[PDB]
Amino acid sequence: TRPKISLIVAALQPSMGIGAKGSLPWRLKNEMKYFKDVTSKAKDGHINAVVMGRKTWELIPERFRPLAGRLNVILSRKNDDLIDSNGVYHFSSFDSVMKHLEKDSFRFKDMPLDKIFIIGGSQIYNLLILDSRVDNLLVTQVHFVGEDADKPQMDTFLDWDLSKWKRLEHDKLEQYVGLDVPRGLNEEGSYNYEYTMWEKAQ
């Protein structure tokens, strides 16, 4: 995997709810912008991939899709590993798409891939945390500071193992994503959140 693989996710402290049934009980305005800047930022002449599940794809409004400036990869169990004329990859598994990219030297429309972001929620976050090809986690740590009755009843939890990841210094996050990042906590109505990066083992 010549490109770096990132798994980018917003978890809720300290329990780590990934979704409440499937909606995300927060509109974090500056989170959306962070996500756009991070996934689009590549070297000159390079491009990034965005990898997501069928259901995340359908949640994006027609307006904004395919996610512009990125290789868009959609994973569904029974996809047939097809590429449509717009360059969107319709694949059945992450391993299937890594194989196909590897045969083309990790290039998309003759551009080198730089970073691959798994964004895909639900489903594939927990299917893919376990894959050792994953180089790092980009975790938006979220804190609820509202009014009790506003507290999210989180349904699905990031199958993370505290033992496997070490948090990186902010400079390393900024180097990696290639952009200055607001540091410390970010307060947005009923929520506090901060951007973090984790890599594995020794």
Residue numbers in the entry: 2 to 203
Which text from the study accompanies this structure?
Dihydrofolate reductase (DHFR) is a key and essential enzyme in the folate pathway that converts dihydrofolate (DHF) to tetrahydrofolate (THF). This coenzyme is required for a variety of cellular processes, including the synthesis of purine involved in nucleic acid and amino-acid biosynthesis. The active site is located in a cleft formed by α-helix 1, α-helix 2, α-helix 4 and β-sheet 1, similar to CglDHFR and CalDHFR. As classified in E. coli DHFR, CauDHFR could also be designated to have two subdomains: the nucleotide subdomain, in which the NADPH sits, and the substrate-binding subdomain, which is predominantly formed by α-helix 1, α-helix 2 and β-sheet 1.
The structure of apo CauDHFR was determined by molecular replacement using the structure of CalDHFR as a model, while the structures of the CauDHFR–NADPH, CauDHFR–NADPH–PYR and CauDHFR–NADPH–CYG complexes were also solved by molecular replacement using the structure of apo CauDHFR as a model. Crystals of apo and holo CauDHFR have a single protomer in the asymmetric unit, while the ternary complexes CauDHFR–NADPH–PYR and CauDHFR–NADPH–CYG contained two protein molecules which are independent and do not form a quaternary structure, according to the PISA server. Analysis of the NADPH binding sites of the four obtained structures shows that the holoenzyme and the CauDHFR–NADPH–PYR and CauDHFR–NADPH–CYG ternary complexes have the side chains of the NADPH binding site residues in similar conformations, whereas the apoenzyme has more significant differences. This could be caused by the conformational freedom imposed by the lack of cofactor. The substrate-binding regions of apo and holo CauDHFR are largely similar, with the addition of NADPH not making a substantial difference to most residue orientations. The main difference observed is movement of Leu25, with a change of 5 Å between the isopropyl functional groups. Minor movements are also seen in Met33, Thr57, Leu60 and Phe65.
